[PDB]
Structure 1
Amino acid sequence: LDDLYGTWRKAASLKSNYNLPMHKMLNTDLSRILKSPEIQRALRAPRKKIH
């Protein structure tokens, strides 16, 4: 499978010029992203009262 498609740094060997498609986002765990102190600190307090 690596000689056919191959990692993102080593091209495909059996095909002429093919590298695995790149990723539009790496850490796809937006739960871990969202409850992270980096982002958690930069938020206003939730306005969770119903009027």
Structure 2
Amino acid sequence: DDLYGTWRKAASLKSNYNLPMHKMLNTDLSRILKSPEIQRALRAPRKKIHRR
């Protein structure tokens, strides 16, 4: 925690270095998708096979 730092504190044993930043913070895509907020905004799924 002093070699590379936390996010609140920089690296004590490096000159100017902080921990890299997450481009997304919650990576649980399944937990994101089946959460209620997205599901109320989704349209109805079209699950039916219309073959020739």
With normalisation by structure 2, the TM-score equals 0.92
* Structure 1 consecutive aligned stretches of length 4 or more whose deviation exceeds 4 Å: none
Displacement of 1:3 in angstroms is 0.9
**For 1:19-30, what aligned pairs fall within 5 Å after superposition?**
19-30=18-29
Identical-pair percentage: 100
**What CA RMSD, in Å, does the superposition of the two structures yield over aligned residues?**
0.5
2:11 counterpart residue number: 12
Q: Which runs of 5+ in 2 are unaligned?
A: none
What is the aligned length? 50
Displacement of 1:27 in angstroms is 0.4
Superposed CA offset, 1:2-37 (max 9, x none): 110010110000000000000000000010000011
Between the aligned partners of 1:17 and 1:23, the Cα distance in structure 2 is: 19
Between the aligned partners of 1:30 and 1:43, the Cα distance in structure 2 is: 16
Between the aligned partners of 2:36 and 2:2, the Cα distance in structure 1 is: 41
With normalisation by structure 1, the TM-score equals 0.94
Q: Which runs of 5+ in 1 are unaligned?
A: none
